[PDB]
Design a protein around this nucleic acid. Structure first.
Lengths: 228, 251
RNA sequence: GAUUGACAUUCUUGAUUUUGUGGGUGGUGGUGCAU
C-alpha cells in the first residue's frame, strides 16, 4: 500500500501536469492561430507612432580615448613561489625517474641576416621572434618553420671559418643556444620533426661517404639535443 | 481597443511550462504599442520560463527608452519581490539565466538595472548575490570602467563597496580615470568618514584586493598616501603583503 | 559589416564586437561566535 500510494500519487500529479501542459500548448496554438495576423485589424486603429547617462557615456568614451593597464594576473608571496617551485621540481624529477624506469624558410634567414658577423645575428633572430609571437593571431607555421631554420642555421654555421673572431663566435653561439632552448621549450612538436629528418639525412650522408660527410657541426648537434 | 487575445496569453503564461510562443508576442517589437498592450495584459502573474524568453525578446528590442519602458517599472521590482518572498533567499536559476540573457545589450544597461538597484531595498546579501551574477558572465569593459567611476562617485553604502570590490577582483587593465578614481576614494575616506564611520574587515579586504595588483600606475606620492592609509588603518593582515605591493609596483 | 530578433530563403537590431594568443578554478554553500 505504501508503494501503491507513491505510484498512484505520482501518476495522478503526472497526469495533471500532462493535462495542464497540453492545455497550455493548445492555448498557445489557438491564440497564435487567432491572434498572429488576425491582429491586423487592431494594428491600425489603436497605434502609437539623460544627463547621468551622458556622464556614463562620457566616461566610457574617455576610457576609449585613453586608458592604461594592470601588471600581471595575480598577487602572491615568494613563499608560495618556493612551494610551487619545489612542487614542479619534485613532479618533474619523479616523472623523469618514472620515464627512466619505464619569416624564414631555411634560406630566407640566410638571405635576410647575411650582413653582419656575430652579434647582430642573435638580435635579428630575436627580432623575428618579436615579429611573430607578439602579433601571433595565426602564427604557427611561420613559428615552427623559423625554429627549424634556427636549428639548421646553427648547423650550417657551426663549422665554417672559426679563425676569425673566436670569442664573438663563442658568445653568439652560446646566446643562440640559450635563446633556442628558451623559445623551443614551448615548441617541441615542430622542432623534433626537423631533428628526425636531420638524422635521416646524415645517415644518408654516411651511406655514401666513408667518413668525410661527418661535418663537425654534428658534434654540437648531438650536444644541443642532449641539452634540450 | 486592442485585439484582446491577451486574456488567453496571460492565462497560459501565468503557468507556462514548455513549448512555443504566440507569435504576436514574438513580433511585439514590430508593433508600435508594446507597452500599451502589456499594460492591458497586466502580467503581475508570471511564469519564470516566460520571464526568460520575454527578456530574450526584450533584449532583442531594448534601447535606453525601451529599457525604461519595460525593465525599470515592473520586472526589476518583480525580481525584488522574488528575492524578498523567497524565504531561504533562493533566487532561481530561471531568474539568473534571465539576467544573463538580459546582460547582453550594454547601451544603457546602467540605467537598465544598476541605476534602480541602488534606489532602495538593497541589503548586503542581495548585493553579494548581484555582484556574483555580475562576475559570472561577460561584461562590457569600458562600461565596467565607467561603472566603477560613477558607483565610486555615488554615496557610501556597503552594497556599493562589495559591488566595487567584485568589479576590482575582475582583474582589469585599469585606465587612468579609474586609478584617479581610486586615489580620490582614499581621499574620500579620511578624517571624510574616519570619525563619522569605522571600516571593518569587509572594507579592509576590498581595498586589500585593490592593492593586490592595482598599482601599476602609481607614483611615489601615491605610494606615500597609501603608506599612511595603512598606517591609519592598521589591521593584522596588512604588513608584509601591502609592504610587498608597495615594493612591487611601478610608475 | 561584428553580432543580435527572423515574416522558409531575406530584412526590424550595431561593437555587447568577431578570431586567436594566453589565463583567473567555479561560491545562491553547511559548522562555534552577540542575534
Amino acid at each position: 500500500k505504501k508503494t501503491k500510494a507513491e505510484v498512484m500519487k505520482e501518476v495522478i500529479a503526472k497526469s495533471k501536469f500532462y493535462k495542464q501542459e497540453r492545455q497550455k500548448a493548445q492555448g498557445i496554438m489557438e491564440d497564435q492561430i487567432d491572434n498572429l495576423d488576425d491582429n491586423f485589424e487592431d494594428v491600425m486603429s489603436e497605434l502609437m507612432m539623460t544627463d547621468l547617462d551622458k556622464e556614463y557615456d562620457i566616461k566610457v568614451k574617455e576610457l576609449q580615448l585613453d586608458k592604461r593597464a594592470a601588471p600581471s594576473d595575480r598577487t602572491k608571496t615568494e613563499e608560495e613561489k618556493n612551494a610551487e617551485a619545489e612542487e614542479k621540481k619534485r613532479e618533474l624529477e619523479q616523472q623523469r625517474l618514472d620515464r627512466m624506469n619505464g619569416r624564414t624558410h631555411d634560406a630566407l634567414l640566410d638571405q635576410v641576416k647575411k650582413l653582419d658577423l656575430d652579434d647582430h645575428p642573435k638580435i635579428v633572430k630575436n627580432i623575428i621572434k618579436a615579429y611573430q609571437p607578439k602579433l601571433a593571431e595565426g602564427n604557427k607555421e611561420k613559428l615552427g618553420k623559423f625554429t627549424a631554420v634556427l636549428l639548421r642555421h646553427i648547423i650550417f654555421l657551426s663549422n665554417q671559418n672559426y679563425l676569425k673572431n673566436v670569442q664573438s663566435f663563442k658568445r653568439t653561439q652560446n646566446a643562440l643556444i640559450s635563446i633556442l632552448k628558451s623559445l623551443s621549450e614551448k615548441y617541441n612538436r615542430e622542432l623534433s620533426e626537423e631533428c628526425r629528418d636531420y638524422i635521416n639525412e646524415m645517415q644518408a650522408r654516411y651511406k655514401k661517404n666513408h667518413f668525410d660527410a661527418l661535418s663537425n657541426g654534428d658534434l654540437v648537434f648531438f650536444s644541443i639535443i642532449g641539452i634540450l | 481597443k486592442v485585439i484582446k487575445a491577451y486574456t488567453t496569453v496571460g492565462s497560459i503564461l501565468k503557468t507556462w511550462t514548455h513549448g512555443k510562443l504566440p507569435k504576436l508576442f514574438k513580433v511585439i517589437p514590430s508593433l508600435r504599442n508594446w507597452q500599451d498592450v502589456i499594460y492591458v495584459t497586466n502580467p503581475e502573474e508570471w511564469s519564470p520560463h516566460v520571464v526568460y524568453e520575454a527578456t530574450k525578446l526584450f533584449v532583442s528590442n531594448l534601447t535606453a527608452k525601451e529599457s525604461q519602458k519595460f525593465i525599470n517599472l515592473i520586472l526589476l521590482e518583480r525580481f525584488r519581490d522574488n528575492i524578498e518572498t523567497s524565504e531561504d533567499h533562493s533566487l532561481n536559476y530561471h531568474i539568473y539565466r534571465a539576467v544573463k540573457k538580459s546582460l547582453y545589450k550594454p547601451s544603457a544597461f546602467f540605467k537598465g538595472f544598476l541605476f534602480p538597484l541602488v534606489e532602495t531595498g538593497c541589503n548586503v546579501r542581495e548585493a553579494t548575490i548581484a555582484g556574483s551574477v555580475l562576475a559570472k558572465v561577460s561584461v562590457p569593459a569600458l562600461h565596467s570602467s565607467a561603472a566603477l567611476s560613477y558607483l565610486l562617485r555615488l554615496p557610501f553604502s556597503p552594497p556599493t563597496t562589495v559591488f566595487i570590490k567584485i568589479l576590482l577582483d575582475k582583474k582589469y587593465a585599469l585606465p587612468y580615470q579609474t586609478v584617479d578614481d581610486c586615489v580620490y576614494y582614499f581621499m574620500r575616506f579620511r578624517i571624510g568618514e574616519d570619525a563619522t564611520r569605522v571600516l571593518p574587515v569587509i572594507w579592509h579586504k576590498a581595498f586589500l584586493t585593490f592593492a593586490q595588483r592595482y598599482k601599476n600606475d602609481i607614483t611615489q606620492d601615491q605610494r606615500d598616501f597609501l603608506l599612511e592609509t595603512v598606517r591609519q588603518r592598521g589591521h593584522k593582515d596588512i604588513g608584509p603583503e601591502i609592504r610587498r605591493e608597495l615594493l612591487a609596483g611601478a610608475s
